[PDB]
Amino acid sequence: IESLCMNCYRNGTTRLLLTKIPFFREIIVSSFSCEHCGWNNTEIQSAGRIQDQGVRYTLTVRSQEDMNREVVKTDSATTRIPELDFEIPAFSQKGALTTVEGLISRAISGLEQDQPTRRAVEGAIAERIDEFIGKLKDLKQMASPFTLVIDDPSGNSFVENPHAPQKDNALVITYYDRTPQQAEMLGLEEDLRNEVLQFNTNCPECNAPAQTNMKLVQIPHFKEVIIMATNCENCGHRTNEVKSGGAVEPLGTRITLHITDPSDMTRDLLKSETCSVEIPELEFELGMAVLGGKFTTLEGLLKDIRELVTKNPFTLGDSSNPDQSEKLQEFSQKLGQIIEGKMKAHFIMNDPAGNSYLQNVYAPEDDPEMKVERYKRTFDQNEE
């Protein structure tokens, strides 16, 4: 973007850095620089996505000057030319910067480009389209004025006033309060969540410095947890552990997901160090401390499981060749099929401590294919 330098009055360069913020707002950073005199400046502006009021531009077109007017037309805007009973309804076209004449030329092209086909296969309809196209083309000869109406409930559409600071009598601009219909059509204060804050802290056994990574995880659809990942350099002590940070003493949780859709792959997923994972169709269960303490996705976990199991074969307790296991090859094939979306299976996460999460893509509503059972674990066979 070429912009005037206020320090030397040459043209320099403006870079625009845009940031989305919650609740239909945007920050625009305009960073100016001039290579010639070295001057530089930055302005930070905050903008709403939606204006307070809808806008309606009613332009009487009389001259080439009017035809040359720049037009910004948002996707939510309706366009009409009432003298031709013509309408481009909202959401027919994507947002665009054009001109008044450009608008009309694009409409002509939209009708005209397929007329060779239409004239061949639908003669009578094509004849009436040809007749309308001629009416649009006639507007460019400008023997009579016509009206262009652009009505946008978002308020973001724009029609240029080519008469500079002077008045623009040919263009009547009205503003209106949106109906609830208009508001809903547009998808109508702060979101200060901190989903993850991460820091190194002491070794929980040896008090060595900065040996444990601690992640405070505070997502909306799940209780606060702290993930601790140790890997000691001074003592060798290694552990991954998820702990509940809130008041609720967690019960056991058994989550059963029926995997029915490739979309299931992107479900978010925390597995704790006490969470067993089972895929009953594949006769497979993972140890509780395995491949977890990790915030991942279902696809991420399944691919990890595929690597662990099928890419690290061994034999313990017999003389069989670990690289020739029928059941391992069967497992690899079927897991691949689940990952690719070509096979349905149940995925069960069972955590007696309730420190594990699987995204419910229907939240806060129930997922028909996901069942969560809660239970109390009173007995530990390893000694409690």
User: Site map for Zn ion, 189-228, x if CB under 5 A?
Assistant: --------------x--x-x--x-----------------
Nearer to Zn ion, 11 or 320 (CB): 11
Minimum Å distance from CB 35 to Zn ion?
8
In degrees and rounded to multiples of 5, residue 313 shows phi and psi of -65, 145
Give the CA distances from residue 100 to residues 47, 71, 73, 82, 186, in Å, rounded to whole numbers and listed in that order.
26, 6, 10, 15, 25
Task: State which of residues 14, 30, 33, 39 lies at the interface with Zn ion (CB under 5 A).
Answer: 39
Nearer to Zn ion, 8 or 248 (CB): 8
Nearer to Zn ion, 204 or 336 (CB): 204
Helix (H, G, I), strand (E, B) or coil at 107: helix
Minimum Å distance from CB 283 to Zn ion?
39
Task: State which of residues 4, 8, 21, 97 lies at the interface with Zn ion (CB under 5 A).
Answer: 8
- Compute how many residues bind Zn ion; rule: CB under 5 A: 14
Binding positions for Zn ion, 83-102, rule CB under 5 A:
none
* Cis peptide, bond prior to residue 368, ω within 30 of zero: no
> Closest by alpha carbon to 235, among 205, 258, 212, 271?
205
- Which segments of 223-304 are extended strands (E)? 225-231, 238-244, 252-259, 268-271, 276-279, 284-286, 294-297
Task: State which of residues 232, 288, 328, 361 lies at the interface with Zn ion (CB under 5 A).
Answer: 232
Separation of alpha carbons 103 and 328, rounded Å:
63
Strands 252-259 and 370-375 come out as: antiparallel
Helices within the chain (DSSP H only): 64-67, 100-112, 115-121, 123-139, 180-185, 298-310, 326-339
Give the CA distances from residue 372 to residues 162, 273, 289, 356, 362, in Å, rounded to whole numbers and listed in that order.
64, 19, 21, 11, 14
Minimum Å distance from CB 213 to Zn ion?
13
Binding range to Zn ion, per CB under 5 A, among 103-111, 121-129, 231-239, 312-320: 231-239
Taking CB under 5 A as the rule, does residue 4 contact Zn ion? Answer: no
User: Site map for Zn ion, 236-265, x if CB under 5 A?
Assistant: -x----------------------------
Q: What would you measure as the largest C-alpha separation in the chain, in angstroms?
A: 96
Minimum Å distance from CB 9 to Zn ion?
7
Task: State which of residues 31, 37, 258, 332 lies at the interface with Zn ion (CB under 5 A).
Answer: 37
Task: State which of residues 3, 7, 161, 310 lies at the interface with Zn ion (CB under 5 A).
Answer: 7
Taking CB under 5 A as the rule, does residue 235 contact Zn ion? Answer: yes
Distance in Å from the first CA to the final CA of the chain: 69
Taking CB under 5 A as the rule, does residue 289 contact Zn ion? Answer: no
Minimum Å distance from CB 8 to Zn ion?
3
> Closest by alpha carbon to 308, among 280, 321, 289?
289
Nearer to Zn ion, 39 or 86 (CB): 39
Binding range to Zn ion, per CB under 5 A, among 7-15, 220-228, 258-266, 326-334: 7-15
Task: List residues binding Zn ion (CB under 5 A).
Answer: 5, 7-8, 34, 36-37, 39, 203, 206, 208, 211, 232, 235, 237
